[PDB]
């Protein structure tokens, strides 16, 4: 709604999350970049001690 985009018609069971589709669809750089960060924010598995 902020960018005037048609409401996302999201299917239950989609391989992609809504944020991944939106990242592919959002032309604003700051929003798309935050979306990409969320889509790829993961724990790093590290052996410590």
């Amino acid at each position: 709604p902020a960018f005037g985009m048609q409401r996302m018609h999201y299917r239950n069971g989609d391989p992609q999350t809504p944020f991944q589709i939106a990242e592919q669809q959002i032309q604003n750089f700051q929003v798309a970049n935050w979306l990409h960060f969320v889509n790829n924010n993961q724990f790093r598995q590290v052996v410590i001690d």
């Binding site: 990242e23 970049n33 990409h36 790829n40 924010n41 993961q42």
Partner: protein
């Protein structure tokens, strides 16, 4: 080989694709492949050996994964990736060099360097991905005993040989009948000379035949056949077969008569071209038979009739020629050609580090000696080193 090739391919993809500003979706799959390579290589120690003058080098892999956080790659990302890629390219180039300078008589297709032997372990199979190069494709097909194919522009299939045969000769070398030929690379130039111009030939016809056996079967071959042999059409002073004296050749070029080019496989006739010149196709052959004739002109103008007397002395020696250039062909075995740089790369690496002569290749990587004695062991070792040279040339 497939693993080493996959490493080099991943590094080349990373060099070409991890660039400032690029969408992460352009590189996502590449980043996953690269991180898989990092995971597989981490914790493994490699040594690239000290044969010849190649320095002994040790390789340790303790790299962090490439990030996945940016929507567009920035300069910091490119620099971190560049550092990791530079180390990996150094390693792959050193492994390729260490493999190229080694050879084996027993199993020359198998890896010879210790690092390529370690990379053949199952643990590294995760690295393996798209094998789209012609040489790696042929390597995999050969491993499965499938019909391999190497396409060559001007294949260097003929060992260098500039020789002559005298079917008629005498110690003064003034009534000579025979042939002289240059076989070099992809070219054959043959010339039949009769000093008496077939004055006493059974029908005023002097037959010449040249048989060239190819060390490997060639297929789908484009061949230019031209009447004259410009190399054997000027005055020459030629050593005698024993080198004791020198004889004189004063060619005059006549049109070859009844030109018959046969391309033979297993002694059976596959392709026949009679009186055809220009581009011809030999689909599958391993021997070339060129049969031509010096036919005495039934009619001569006074100058022509003066060139060729009825008896000795003979000053103008009637020569017919043939030129045969293999422009393109396909061979199941690796060969040097006019376009690819595999042989030059292997030779350059062997000379740069003064690799001692081994039990497989001639003692300069000299191609005439190699192709003359193209044994199965030599073919195996050459396919290995040429595949490794192509893998190296992907990065270096």
């Amino acid at each position: 080989m497939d693993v080493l090739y996959s490493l080099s391919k991943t590094l080349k993809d990373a060099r070409d694709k991890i660039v400032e500003g690029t969408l992460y979706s352009n590189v996502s799959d590449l980043i996953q492949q690269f991180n898989q390579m990092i995971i597989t290589m981490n914790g493994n120690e490699f040594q690239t050996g000290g044969i010849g003058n190649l320095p002994i080098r040790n390789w340790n892999f303790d790299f962090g994964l490439l990030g996945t956080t940016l929507l567009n790659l920035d300069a910091n990302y490119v620099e971190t990736a560049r550092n990791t890629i530079d180390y990996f390219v150094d390693f792959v180039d050193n492994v390729c060099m260490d493999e190229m300078v080694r050879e084996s008589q027993r199993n020359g297709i198998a890896p010879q360097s210790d690092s390529l032997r370690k990379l053949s372990g199952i643990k590294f199979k995760r690295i393996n991905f798209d094998n789209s190069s012609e040489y790696i494709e042929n390597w995999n097909l050969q491993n499965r005993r499938q019909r391999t194919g190497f396409t060559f522009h001007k294949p260097n299939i003929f060992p260098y040989s500039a020789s002559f045969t005298l079917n008629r000769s005498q110690p003064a070398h003034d009534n000579l009948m025979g042939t002289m030929w240059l076989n070099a690379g992809s070219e054959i130039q043959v010339a039949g000379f009769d000093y008496s111009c077939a004055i006493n030939a059974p029908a005023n016809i002097q037959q010449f035949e040249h048989i060239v056996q190819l060390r490997r079967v060639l297929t789908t071959a484009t061949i230019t056949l031209l009447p004259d042999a410009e190399r054997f059409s000027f005055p020459r002073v030629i050593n005698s077969a024993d080198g004791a004296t020198t004889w004189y050749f004063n060619p005059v070029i006549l049109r070859p008569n009844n030109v018959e080019v046969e391309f033979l496989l297993n002694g059976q006739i596959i392709n026949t071209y009679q009186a055809r010149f220009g581009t011809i196709i030999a689909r599958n052959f391993d021997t070339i038979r060129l049969s031509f004739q010096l036919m005495r002109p039934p009619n001569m103008t006074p100058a022509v009739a003066a060139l060729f007397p009825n008896a000795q002395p003979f000053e103008h020696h009637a020569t017919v020629g043939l030129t045969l250039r293999i422009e393109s062909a396909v061979c199941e075995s690796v060969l040097a050609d006019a376009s690819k740089t595999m042989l030059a790369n292997v030779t350059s690496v062997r000379q740069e580090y003064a690799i001692p002569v081994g039990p497989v290749f001639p003692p300069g990587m000299n191609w005439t000696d190699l192709i003359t004695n193209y044994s199965p062991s030599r073919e195996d070792n050459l396919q290995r080193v040429f595949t490794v040279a192509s893998i190296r040339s992907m990065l270096v």
